[PDB]
Design a protein around this ligand. Structure first.
Ligand SMILES: [Fe+3]
Ligand SMILES: [Fe+3]
Ligand SMILES: [Fe+3]
Ligand SMILES: [Fe+3]
Lengths: 382, 382
């Protein structure tokens, strides 16, 4: 087939960079993050939509691997979020060990340049995102350390409200979009060079963040409200604000977001959604956000990570130009990451003040007097 | 003075690398880790034994900055250790921001090579240690992430027992040295290339770790039991085991560890302790571990970080050779870090199994059957 040869050539020329894959949580589910002597199973998994053989077979160029942990179910919500932070480090650790152990297939990447050098070496550029601010345990310090561990996007919520923003699937609303803390955090995310992810957040939270952010954002895995009404899909109002933001909506493979009858969802629906967004807000603002392994079963023709050539072929068959297909494959999300880096270097370069955690005083006034008195004794020595 | 000119030349030729400084906890105490617009105060502090001006004045070559947090005082010891992990990330964050904000004075280092290139650039090589395994919240995954954030040594305890080892200052003993978990952790610390620190640990814990470790260890800030009996000082038995281990005892400036009458402790006592150890186990196994800012007041002649030239001068005056002084200044701790790297590359190269956290099952048996059945449906597609 000439269209399938074309698709393969495109997958060789530029990377397909997928916005969301929960393979790391499948590794927690199945192996409990103990992958010692499990290579054969990592290449050919007994469960799930991802493994190292099928990953190569789909000619995928890059992947934001999700370091998701569930919303905390502890009745003490302080201890729940603290437990989530620890679980987040467990997920980042298994992601890093997965990459370190299979260096011929996976190569860690945290930038536009490192995506490209990984792709030129024939490897799947392996980036990291966290799926909810419940994972940082109310600590902006923790967030910056997650960034330093390779986290490059932060989904603001999962399916739970947090101190910063409202999730889409939970009602009643807590903050009615972003909180006051949340608004401050947008600035800090821009300042540190963390990509903002608006998937799972409420329509109002999206609107507010899209107005506030000084860097482009993504939807790592969301589809299009006008084609299928769901709290998790992007309204025309927020697609418009995404255009002005210069961001990317990475179209989702979740059947519940593609069609009213989940079991009728199909490869064609994913293409319908890509083409809807590309037509209306431009093909430079749409990408691919599978959310593979955040689902049991995928749509017909997109059952697992081996099916990406079928999506590329499908888009070309519907008259999307090579150049535009290359954009939705990967170029757009690379641009956003590039612009997120540039905005952070600009703000750090201007010497913008970083957000600091509210800490308890550890010293009483007696200790502070002891310390200042001791300092002056040292000053008076000569 | 010709001896002071000699000392200055030595401080230019090789780095003085100090084993322990709690300036980061002073920054938490005084600023609550908010150093925005505080440069003038960071250069000339109103409290403590460390600031950026006095750091330059002492001609210090490198520093392991402590990311210490207190032993958890919560009656629920699960929530206490989880809180400590979060506080650890707060301390690592302020250390990293301190270094990033003053790049002409401080340069981050995590290796022998990065110490040297920092020293050749005229900067204080800034390494990181954590002071107790209470700080990792029973998570070996967290430990590896701390390593990836730049932590290069781990003091096994502070002044509290943990799941892994016994602190010196607490009785009764919990494990009687290391626990079974603790013995396993020694292997993992060797495997990941984390330097083991035996300061604050019990005499029995030291003996066991010194027998078990396949890489050299340090005492980041301990002095010599035979000169002054204290639970925190190193016995002749453990100095012997340190020699066979090939490790380094970094001599402490804490007055309580130098003399029975704290207020009589003096620069000469620090030199007595260095010379004791260097004479008996060799000058290649002794270093400098001030523990500045883990004390209110230091000994006469070693009041703050500007006093290092006096220590170098003091050692030369007592007939310690240039070459041996250069060793205790920095060469020895650099060797240990070098050997800790080499041992880790050897064990990772042999494909040694890494230690994994004991995790809860997240999926029941119904979910696993659903997932395996779904996998076979995908296998049967063609
Ligand atoms: Fe997910
Ligand atoms: Fe999701
Ligand atoms: Fe300390
Ligand atoms: Fe200490």
């Amino acid at each position: 087939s000439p269209i399938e040869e074309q698709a393969t050539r495109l997958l060789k020329e530029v990377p397909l960079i997928d916005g969301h894959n929960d393979f790391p949580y499948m590794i927690r589910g199945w192996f409990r993050n103990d992958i010692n002597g499990q290579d054969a199973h990592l290449y050919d998994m007994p469960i799930g939509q991802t493994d190292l053989q099928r990953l190569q077979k789909g000619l995928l160029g890059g992947q934001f691997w999700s370091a998701f942990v569930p919303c905390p179910k502890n009745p003490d919500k302080e201890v729940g979020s603290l437990e989530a932070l620890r679980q987040t480090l467990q997920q980042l650790d298994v992601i890093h060990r997965l990459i370190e152990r299979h260096p011929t297939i996976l190569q860690f990447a945290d930038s536009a340049a490192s995506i490209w050098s990984s792709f030129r070496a024939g490897r799947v550029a392996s980036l990291i995102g966290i799926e909810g601010l419940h994972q940082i345990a109310d600590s902006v310090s923790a967030l910056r350390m997650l960034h330093r561990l390779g986290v490059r996007y932060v989904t603001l919520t999962h399916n739970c409200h947090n101190a910063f923003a409202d999730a889409a699937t939970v009602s009643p609303e807590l903050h009615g979009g972003l909180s006051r803390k949340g608004e401050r955090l947008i600035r800090e995310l821009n300042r540190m060079g963390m990509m903002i992810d608006l998937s799972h957040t409420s329509h109002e939270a999206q609107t507010q963040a899209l107005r506030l952010s000084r860097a482009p954002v993504i939807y790592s895995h969301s589809s299009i409200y006008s084609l299928r009404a769901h709290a998790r899909n992007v309204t025309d109002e927020n697609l418009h604000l995404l255009h002005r933001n210069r961001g990317v909506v990475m179209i989702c493979f979740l059947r519940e977001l593609l069609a009213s009858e989940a079991d009728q969802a199909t490869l064609a629906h994913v293409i319908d959604h890509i083409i809807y967004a590309g037509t209306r807000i431009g093909y430079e603002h749409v990408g691919i956000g599978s959310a593979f392994d955040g689902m049991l079963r995928g749509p017909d023709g997109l059952h697992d990570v081996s099916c990406y050539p079928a999506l590329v072929a499908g888009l070309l068959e519907r008259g999307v130009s090579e150049e535009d297909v290359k954009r939705v494959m990967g170029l757009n999300v690379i641009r956003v990451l590039e612009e997120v880096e540039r905005v952070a270097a600009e703000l750090q370069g201007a010497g913008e003040e970083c957000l600091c955690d509210e800490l308890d005083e550890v010293w009483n006034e007696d200790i502070k007097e002891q310390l200042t008195r001791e300092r002056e004794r040292v000053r008076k020595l000569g």
